[PDB]
Design a protein around this ligand. Structure first.
Ligand SMILES: COc1nc(N)nc2c1ncn2[C@@H]1O[C@H](CO)[C@@H](O)[C@H]1O
Ligand SMILES: COc1nc(N)nc2c1ncn2[C@@H]1O[C@H](CO)[C@@H](O)[C@H]1O
Ligand SMILES: [Zn+2]
Ligand SMILES: [Zn+2]
Lengths: 157, 157
């Protein structure tokens, strides 16, 4: 199940970078094995720098479920959430986060050196008790290769 | 300059709680003393936990200026931006942030202890070069009074 939804997030990343909707990032929000939202970066399509994959998925899931809290839901991110997106995940009350690639893979192709302290447990003020799973093995390898695979299909923002 | 726009953000907070749109928070994005966006919390209105005043203002200013970066603009927040909104401010490339009330003022009336390390200078993985101004004197008094005045006039989230 973890592999299935992380794979879906990776496919969302590829599909979005191929749509021109934005960067190669995907996010899937699940409610007891039922997919609530399946999204990718929409920064370019929406002219919205907050329209990240995780934020877009949170917005869609909350609108679909008619509630501002997703405490019975989990989020699968193709790449490690940035500070903004991790803050959005915290505010969403999502109960579990599974991400595929480390932020360094996105940074290696020119993305912002923009990493969430609360995710890595390196903050003074911002804490996290959110359940966080770093994927390993096959799905992790695929998610990390996402960025080397899609460097030509888009220009960074 | 700063006091007028900070007071407009505070007025946005009051209007938002009066409308039931969300919590007592406002944000005003300006470009050389010209307001590009004036917003408040829309979390309850939009059923969107990311619809913070700062995020909403960034969305609307990016729509108005037809671009995803606001490097020529400044943002006034009635209260200290949370980690999500500070990440959004970083991503939007806003060149200056002026905030009125410290996050403790919002915490003292029931909001989460949810503070951005990068804003306060305690970040390790997230570093901001943004010019940040904490308001003093009358602006600080107004912004802090927001939370005493709006106590139990809105639903918490
Ligand atoms: C769209 O969904 C996204 N998801 C993630 N996770 N990151 C994204 C992103 N869009 C841009 N980025 C940048 O990638 C690094 C984060 O690792 C930071 O530099 C981000 O600004
Ligand atoms: C919508 O506009 C907002 N702006 C800011 N800055 N904060 C907000 C907020 N809505 C709720 N909050 C909470 O207040 C604390 C941050 O000081 C945290 O707990 C936040 O979740
Ligand atoms: Zn993000
Ligand atoms: Zn915020």
């Amino acid at each position: 199940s973890d592999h299935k939804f992380l794979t879906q997030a990776v496919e969302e990343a590829y599909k979005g970078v191929d749509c021109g909707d934005g960067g190669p990032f995907g996010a899937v929000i699940v409610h007891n094995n039922e997919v609530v939202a399946s999204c990718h970066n929409m920064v370019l399509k929406y002219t919205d720098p907050t329209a990240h994959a995780e934020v877009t998925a949170i917005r869609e899931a909350c609108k679909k479920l008619n509630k501002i809290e997703l405490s019975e839901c989990e989020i699968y991110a193709s790449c490690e959430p940035c500070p903004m997106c991790f803050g959005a995940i915290h505010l969403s009350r999502l109960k579990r986060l599974v991400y595929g690639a480390k932020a360094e893979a996105a940074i290696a192709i020119g993305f912002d050196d923009f990493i969430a302290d609360a995710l890595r447990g390196t903050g003074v003020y911002q804490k996290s008790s959110l359940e966080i799973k770093k994927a390993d093995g096959n799905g992790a390898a695929i998610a990390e290769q996402v960025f080397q695979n899609t460097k030509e299909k888009f220009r960074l923002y």
